[PDB]
């Protein structure tokens, strides 16, 4: 779930003779790699999301006041989904929480329903117009990691994200980066830009020791998968229970260069 639904759940509809603005708060506390979602407006509900490009732009402040580009404000943010429910509007948005080693920090978006009402007066208080707003606040707490992701940065030996890394002088015999992983472990790797990743859907499927592609769903169901093809960056989390010792591989390759092999040894654990 992890969803702020202002259409159906945190309803922003105005009520008969409502005269006073109302604000509702939807607080989400995702873990790393999890997906958060806002639903704001539909074919029948005329509600507007602020900033309009949320989550690509967010507000740093709960009072809706300091606009940030999330790719700069929460480094690593890169996976986004958007959906229109009515023409020329984006009403449903999602983003996946990237690994973050900086302290916890909020990000805000807002859903608004507006209307102008006439306040009928009397006895020396003339009638007036009043704009009222039902505002939904989306507060996402960006969690903090206390250890590096178990995995391989093939772009630098001074990685801030990954437990192991390789310098350009080393990647310029194949490199085989091995991680030993247990249940619920967060793993991943990053390959240089113009390298190809096999299988393309690494972590949904992978190479096995026979060198064959296998879909991992029935052997080792990695969860919360991020396949950032734009940045050649891959993350997932090991399942909550591991009943067998497994080894799987993904391979980054570029013509006339050594291959960069990522491997995981998953061990029995609960």
């Amino acid at each position: 779930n992890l969803t702020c639904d202002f259409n159906d759940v945190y309803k922003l509809e105005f009520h008969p003779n409502q005269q006073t603005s109302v604000t509702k708060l939807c607080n989400l506390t995702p873990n790393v790699l999890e997906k958060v979602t806002i639903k704001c407006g539909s074919d029948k509900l005329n509600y507007n999301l602020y900033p309009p490009t949320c989550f690509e732009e967010v507000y740093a402040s709960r009072n809706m006041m300091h606009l940030k580009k999330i790719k700069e404000f929460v480094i690593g943010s890169s996976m986004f989904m958007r959906r229109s429910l009515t023409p020329n509007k984006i009403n449903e948005v999602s983003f996946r929480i990237p690994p973050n080693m900086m302290p916890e920090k909020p990000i805000y978006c807002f859903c608004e329903n507006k209307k102008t009402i006439t306040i009928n007066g009397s006895n020396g208080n003339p009638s007036s117009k009043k704009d009222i707003i039902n505002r939904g606040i989306v507060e996402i707490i960006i969690p903090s990691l206390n250890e590096k992701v178990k995995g391989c940065d093939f772009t630098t030996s001074e990685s801030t994200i990954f437990s192991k890394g390789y310098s350009i002088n080393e990647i310029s015999q194949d490199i085989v980066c091995t991680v030993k992983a247990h249940a619920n472990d967060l793993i991943g790797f990053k390959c240089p830009s113009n390298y190809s990743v096999e299988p393309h859907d690494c972590f949904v499927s992978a190479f096995n020791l026979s060198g064959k592609n296998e879909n991992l769903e029935n052997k080792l169901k990695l969860t919360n998968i991020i396949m950032d093809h734009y940045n050649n960056t891959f993350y997932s989390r090991l399942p909550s229970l591991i009943s067998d010792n497994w080894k799987f591989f993904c391979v980054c390759s570029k013509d006339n260069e050594k291959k960069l092999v990522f491997t995981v040894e998953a061990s029995i654990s609960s």
Epitope: Q173, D174, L209, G211, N245, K247, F249, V251, T263, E265
Partner: nanobody, 118 residues
Framework: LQESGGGLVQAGGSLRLSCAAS????????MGWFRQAPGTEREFVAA????????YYADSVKGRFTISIDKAKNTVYLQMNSLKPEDTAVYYC??????????????WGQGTQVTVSS
Amino acid sequence: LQESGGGLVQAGGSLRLSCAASGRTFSSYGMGWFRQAPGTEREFVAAISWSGDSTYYADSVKGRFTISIDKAKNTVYLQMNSLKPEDTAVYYCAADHALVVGGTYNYWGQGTQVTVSS
């Protein structure tokens, strides 16, 4: 790479294969035994982590073969028991990603032949 220890054995019997690596080229690597017979593809048999703390077996040999390692002498052993005619093949020692990287793997040796009579 020195691959040795193969030969002719009666069905039901045991053989112990040895793979001696006279270099540091393989100590970053998990190590595997692979096998191929005329008419079939090269297949995975068993692998062991560089520490020795982890082992993996092809389903068809689990419970009959054991892989083990002697790091001081850079040697990998495959102890084969209850041998089956199905096990007849040339056996090869290689880093355990050898089949993963395919045609770029540059250290395949001649291997050691194993024939199981019936």
